[PDB]
Amino acid sequence: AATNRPDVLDTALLRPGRLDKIIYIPPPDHKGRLSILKVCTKTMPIGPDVSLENLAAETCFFSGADLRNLCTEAALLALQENGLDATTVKQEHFLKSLKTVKPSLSCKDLALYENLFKKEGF
Amino acid sequence: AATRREIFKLQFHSMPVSNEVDLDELILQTDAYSGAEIVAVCREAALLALEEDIQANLIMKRHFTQALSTVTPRIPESLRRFYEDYQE
């Protein structure tokens, strides 16, 4: 069973005998966000000016799906500004696409889980 | 500024406008103007030039100064600051 709002869940469902070994799916970190960008940029032709470590330092409160939207929209901007026939995605296309993809996490949602984390409930 | 010049050039093609008006000064005063309101400024300046001499041929600059005082932007400055801070 998977859920994203576990405060609503019943206490009798979370008992020894019903549902045990609760596992937490961590919102990502810097070493973790570098590995998501290598999976997405595997097929894409990347120029040798792009450094993926500098993009992951500026990226904060991103989910996994928002990293996929950043690589999708920076690839579409290279087709727009360099014609229909182009083999180039540069570093400046990634920084120009940070103005139109916004983070979808905050400290209000993130500290909810790490509080239930702390007993209270889970 | 380039989009508002194309909206003004479509409306100045039909109306008899004198050569005394300055287009660059009108572009600067119509900041935060929607595209439907630039049609309404050009329509009202033609009606105000008709009132001071039914038989009118050309529109002066003084009609445009009075027409911009009547038609205002509907968008307040709170929504202007929010939609520029959302892109940053």
Side-chain angles (χ1 to χ4, degrees), chain B residues 46-58:
Chain B
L47 289 160
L48 285 189
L50 261 189
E51 116 171 345
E52 256 79 44
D53 189 343
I54 169 73
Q55 266 97 59
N57 290 318
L58 294 174

Side-chain angles (χ1 to χ4, degrees), chain B residues 1-38:
Chain B
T3 307
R4 281 194 299 253
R5 194 182 281 267
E6 302 272 347
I7 298 174
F8 266 115
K9 259 300 293 170
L10 195 145
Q11 300 287 332
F12 282 173
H13 187 193
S14 200
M15 282 145 188
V17 194
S18 68
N19 48 2
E20 208 263 328
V21 292
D22 291 331
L23 198 54
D24 292 326
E25 184 178 1
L26 301 174
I27 286 300
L28 296 179
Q29 302 173 220
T30 58
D31 211 347
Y33 263 60
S34 302
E37 286 163 3
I38 307 169

